[PDB]
Structures are given as C-alpha cells and as structure tokens.
Ligand binder design. Structure first.
Ligand SMILES: O=C(c1cc(=O)[nH]c(=O)[nH]1)N1CCN(c2ccc(Br)c(Cl)c2)CC1
Ligand SMILES: O=C(c1cc(=O)[nH]c(=O)[nH]1)N1CCN(c2ccc(Br)c(Cl)c2)CC1
Lengths: 306, 306
C-alpha cells in the first residue's frame, strides 16, 4: 500500500538524449534511429528571438553549423530539415539503444513522465499532467529545452512532449514530437499568456478512490447525486464537467471499492462546498488532480513493464 | 523555474534488477558484479514466517534451490551466503551493466529515489525521505521486496535501501545493502510498530527557501528569532530541533535569497502558531518536509549527472 507521485523508469529514454549546439546556443536533442529531434529555436540568436523567420534562418545554415554530441562521441550531421516547430537532424550513425517507440499527442488531463536534461545529460525524472489550458506545471531551468515527456506502454515508449519554453507565469509550454505546439503558443520570445486553468474532475475522483483503497474513508457519505446535479456544482468551482465516458473509465475503481461513481461524486460535492476542515486525504490538504484513473490502477493494483 | 518531487534517473539501476525465486516465493534481486543481493526472507515458507531460524533454513538449501532470472537469461547460482538480513547469491556471470557503485547508510531526514520492481522488472520511480522513526512512506504492493533505494553522486550510484516489509500502519521498513535494518525492526511476520514520527525541520526550511526562489513570499515577515526561542516552539509542534549545523547547511539558500536562516525561522514560527489561513506554498496547503537543502539547490540552481 501507499501512494506516491510515481514516474516511469527512465532508462530507455536516457540512452536517447544528446546535446545539440548551433553557434553559441546549446540544448537537448532526442536521438532515435539516425534522426536527432530538437526545438527549432536552437537556430535563433538574440536578434531573431522577438520575430524569427525560421525559413530564412534555416536556409542560411549548413550541416557543419550543427554540433551533436552523444556523451563524448560526436555525431556527424549529414542532413537537416524542419517539421513544424521541431528540427530534424539526420546523422551518420543510428542510435543502437533506440527503443521501440511511437509519437503520440496526448489530451488535457493525461499524465506523463518528464526526463529533465541539461547539456544532453539526464538530471531528474518527474510526473506531471497536461493542464486543461495546454500548459504543464514543470520544473525546468535554463538549458532544459528539448527535454522530453513520455509514457511507457508495455515495452514501447510513447513520446508525447518536447519542452520549448517557460511562460511568464512560471508554467511551461512545448510541442508534440511532430512539432505541433500544445496550446495557442508560438516559439518566439513575445509576451504570451495561458488561458485560465480548471481542475481535472475525473482525476480528483480517481484520487479519492486511491484514498479509499489506502484506508482514508472519512469523506464518504451515504448520499448520491446525478451527473447533472454534480456538474452544476462543479461548474461553480472551476471544475471540468463530468461525462458518462468518465464514469465508465472509473468503473474498475468503483468495482474494487464497491463505491459507485455517483456516490463518490456526492462526497466530492460536499468537499467542494464545506472544505476539508483541517483533515487530509493521502497526506494532502488539497484535492489532487494530477493522477489519472489508469495511474491509480497501476499503483493500487500493479502493472510492471519489460 | 517550478518545483517538483524529482527522482534520480533510474537507468543505471534498471540494468541491475533480477528476479529471485526460492521454492514458491519470488522477489527482486540486485545484481552487481557476480553477486545477487536480496532479502533473506525469500527462504521462508508459511510455517517459518512467524519465528524463522535463518541459519537452519539456509543450511537446508543448495545452490540449485535458487532460481535467478535476468529478463530471459538464467543465471547459475554457484554459491550462497548470508550477511545480516541480506542473502548474497554468487552467480557464474558478472553483470556487464554494473555501474560504479557504493553502499551507504543514510540518516533520518535524507532523501533517496526508490525503483519499485515486480518480478525483476522496474515499474516506477519515486522520491522519498527516511523518516525520523526509520520508516519510509513508500508505495509498494505484493511482490516488491528487494526493490532498492539509491542516490546518484556524479557518475556513482549510492545504494542505501533494500525493501523488506510493510508495517501494519502502511509504512515501509528495510535494510541498508549490508543487511542492517533501518530502525528497531526484524524480518519476521510479527506485530511491530514504528515509533512516533516527527517533522524534519531543516527540510521544511529548505522548502520555504524554494518557495521564495519561485516567487511565493506571502509568509515572510521582518522579525527574527534565536535558535533556542525557535526550538522551544518547534518542540511543542513535534518538530525536530534545529542545530547550528542545520543553519550552515542552509547557507547557500540564505545567500541566494538574501534571507537569513533565523529570519526564515521566525516565518516558520508564525506558520506553526497561526496556520496558512487557506493560502498555499508551492501548491501545497501543508508544510512539506521531504526535500533536503541539497534537493532544493539541485532543482533551483541546477546539477546534472553523467
Ligand atoms: O532554457 C531555457 C529555459 C526553459 C525553461 O523552462 N525555463 C528557464 O528558465 N529557461 N530557455 C528559455 C527559452 N529560450 C528560448 C530561446 C529562443 C526562443 Br525563439 C524561445 Cl521561444 C525560447 C531558450 C532558453
Ligand atoms: O511483497 C510483500 C509486500 C511488501 C509491501 O510493502 N507491501 C505489501 O503489500 N506486500 N510481502 C509482504 C512481506 N513478505 C514477508 C515475507 C516473509 C517475512 Br519473514 C517477512 Cl518479514 C515479510 C513478503 C511479501
């Protein structure tokens, strides 16, 4: 038992991280097969950041302008292209540690692990959620661009995020691995703001089920509510509305605890209207919304990865 | 910027995890050079768990009673011995992925990363602290025994924890890699209880410095206190006393923020006596004590690992 913010083991990804230098700018790249992927803003200088024309900037570059290092080994760049906001550097050597992988775009509310890197070298791993406003609340310092987010499905790494920038409010923004930005952001050093965030309701419910599994039951009650009655209260507190699809997803947790979803919604309704009154749930004094139903099952039932 | 519960990258450890079977009992082992380390209670059956005599139990075993699997490859056990509460299985093949490593015993209040494993296969990584009562608040299911805790110093893995059991209160207990139990626990299925836990004061202060670095300043004030005045209040709230050694350790964070340690102690004194009044610090409504001063520096200043 117990419940922790658990990340995926990062070994399969650590062997793919490289350092990419263009001019006086260095950041991280992702080396799969014979391609290195990195944020295209590595080709910007100080004069270009405010309003870059990436097509012009890229045509003025040659392969030898790009220095790629995998530890000590230097990778020779034999070609380069741009795919949306990502630069694809073709190199002469295919990464022998290339895992089975795919590129997936995730949805708001889903979670993934982040491998924070500096100078191509892995620094730490942590779990986060894609927020409803398409930002993530990450932890990144200067030099972290090109760090990736991933999930592990069986033996397959699903890459879903590459880090590009920090917004003024301290939250982070990036792209999928096809270079399409999550959210209405662009890779230029202008003043961009995220929209208002909301709380991920289906995740809060999954976490309340994790609490019950771990012996925290004080917030339960005998009432029940309807989907429309709950959603009417949730709207008032900046909570995402709950759909029938969310109810079915919570099914396995309802069965393991014998507590129906709509029963749990009534408990959440009370917690929203009255607060926790100095009591905690799973060691938190706030409602946690960065665990999906699958995260809870994986940690409260058990799923390993070969 | 940002602040997350960050674990160390686990790749170097994932290549050392193996499955160890003795009879109908399977758990995880740590394979370094030509030795596999695992909890000695793998040699217990149902009749032995209540009052095991491990010397008798071990003499009745031969090398062929121990099945060790590294993925698919079977490792031939050519010898076995017992070191305190750990079994050392000598195998015919040295692990070629053996990293530079050492065995260290950590102190209460220090943090480490846990690689949770099932059937020799890594499942997740998370950060935790050794509590003042020598337990950890982990997340472990049936089959997790032999999972290890570690820190990474430069390129060296310092192994500090091997998981042995869950106590009745839901917290976890284990040994260092020499097989010496952290705390007054023994590997028998009797009713053992942890002593009362206290809050790790130097860690709370480090976290308040992380908050200031990340722009949370509402709890600051202009007062100052003495070490003895603070400790008098901290004792009342089940907080570890603060020593001059703790003050020096916090030095780098005091310098980066310009806020003296004793100034921060006065803020903490107020937070203990008045509460947070519905306000949060770094997204928490409770005082967090599982980040050391070094954790904060590493995340709020930057340290990678080759
Ligand atoms: O490495 C970091 C960084 C990431 C982070 O999350 N937090 C932090 O403090 N620093 N930066 C800032 C973004 N930057 C950047 C350069 C050109 C363009 Br065009 C754009 Cl859009 C961004 C590259 C360097
Ligand atoms: O795998 C787990 C486990 C760990 C955990 O943390 N949580 C959980 O639920 N299960 N166990 C329980 C301990 N057990 C065990 C066997 C013999 C002896 Br003698 C002792 Cl002392 C313990 C081996 C099997």
């Amino acid at each position: 038992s117990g419940f922790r913010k658990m990340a995926f083991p990062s070994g399969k990804v650590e062997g793919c991280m490289v350092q990419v230098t263009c001019g006086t700018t260095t950041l991280n790249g992702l080396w799969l097969d014979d391609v290195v992927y990195c944020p295209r803003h590595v080709i910007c200088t100080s004069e270009d950041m405010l309003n870059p024309n990436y097509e012009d900037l890229l045509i003025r570059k040659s392969n030898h302008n790009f220095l790629v290092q995998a530890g000590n080994v230097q990778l020779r760049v034999i070609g380069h292209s741009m795919q949306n906001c990502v630069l694809k550097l073709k190199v002469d050597t295919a990464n022998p540690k290339t895992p089975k992988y795919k590129f997936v775009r995730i949805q708001p509310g889903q979670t993934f692990s982040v491998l924070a890197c500096y100078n191509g070298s892995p620094s730490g791993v942590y779990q986060c959620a894609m927020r409803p406003n398409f930002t993530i609340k990450g932890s990144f310092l200067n030099g972290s661009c090109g760090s990736v987010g991933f999930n592990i499905d069986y033996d397959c790494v699903s890459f879903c995020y590459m880090h590009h920038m920090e917004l003024p409010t301290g939250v982070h923004a990036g792209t999928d691995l096809e270079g399409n930005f999550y959210g209405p952001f662009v890779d230029r050093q202008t003043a961009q703001a995220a929209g208002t965030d909301t709380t991920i309701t289906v995740n809060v419910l999954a976490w309340l089920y994790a609490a019950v599994i771990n012996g925290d039951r004080w917030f339960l009650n005998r009432f029940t509510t309807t989907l429309n009655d709950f959603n009417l209260v949730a709207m008032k507190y900046n909570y995402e509305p709950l759909t029938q699809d969310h109810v079915d997803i919570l099914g396995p947790l309802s069965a393991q605890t014998g507590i129906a979803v709509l029963d749990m919604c009534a408990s959440l309704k009370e917690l929203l209207q009255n607060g926790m009154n100095g009591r905690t749930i799973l060691g938190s004094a706030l409602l946690e919304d960065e665990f999906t139903p699958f995260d809870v099952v994986r940690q409260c039932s058990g799923v390993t990865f070969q």
